Ligand binder design. Structure first.
Ligand code: CL
Length: 190
């Protein structure tokens, strides 16, 4: 016999500026007796149980997010004399840990019809990698380390907003990102 899989949710979001609060809540059944929350920094590595003293009836409130908190979380609860399966994973990212890079389009944010545009994400300090996000933002990463990364984007549709930001990060902390670049809006004429 099984008990329902729990849900793990983050409030206010899964992506949090350094030093800002976030609450991770494991939702078990209403009869849940005990909870275990876990964090993984990378795949097929250690699994850390969040210390029980940090968690109150399944709620891990983080008043001020730090490097240590980032990573992939999962949880389980105990009911009817068994531990549940693990929740679906939740990824917690901290932004704002480095100065923001600059994101620019070449030759310009106006894309040729049917074509693509060259984007440059540039930083004053070298990063292990860069991230391009299109605004639930969808993000891709590229190697530069070095101080800039080049991204191709397109084709761009005439009827849709096409808004991008970029971040830098280091390879040994892939869930800790810079402050985001300013927004870049691409468009095609018409
Ligand atoms: Cl912790």
């Amino acid at each position: 016999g099984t008990i329902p899989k729990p849900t793990l949710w983050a409030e206010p979001d899964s992506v949090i500026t350094q030093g800002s609060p976030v609450t991770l809540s494991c939702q078990g059944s209403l009869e849940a007796q005990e909870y275990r929350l876990y964090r993984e920094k990378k795949s097929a590595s250690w699994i850390t149980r969040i210390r029980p003293e940090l968690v109150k009836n399944g709620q891990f409130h983080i008043p001020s997010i730090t490097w240590e908190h980032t990573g992939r979380y999962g949880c389980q609860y105990y009911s009817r004399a068994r531990w549940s399966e693990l929740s679906d994973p939740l990824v917690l990212v901290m932004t704002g840990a480095y100065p923001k890079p600059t994101l620019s389009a070449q030759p310009s944010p106006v894309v040729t019809s049917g074509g693509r545009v060259t984007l440059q994400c540039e930083s004053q300090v070298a990063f292990g990698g860069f991230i391009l996000c299109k605004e639930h933002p969808q993000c891709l990463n590229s190697q530069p380390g070095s101080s800039r990364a080049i991204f191709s984007v397109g084709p761009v549709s005439p009827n849709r907003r096409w808004s991008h930001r970029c971040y830098g990060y280091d390879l040994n902390s892939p869930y800790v990102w810079s402050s985001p670049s300013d927004l870049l809006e691409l468009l095609v004429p018409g």
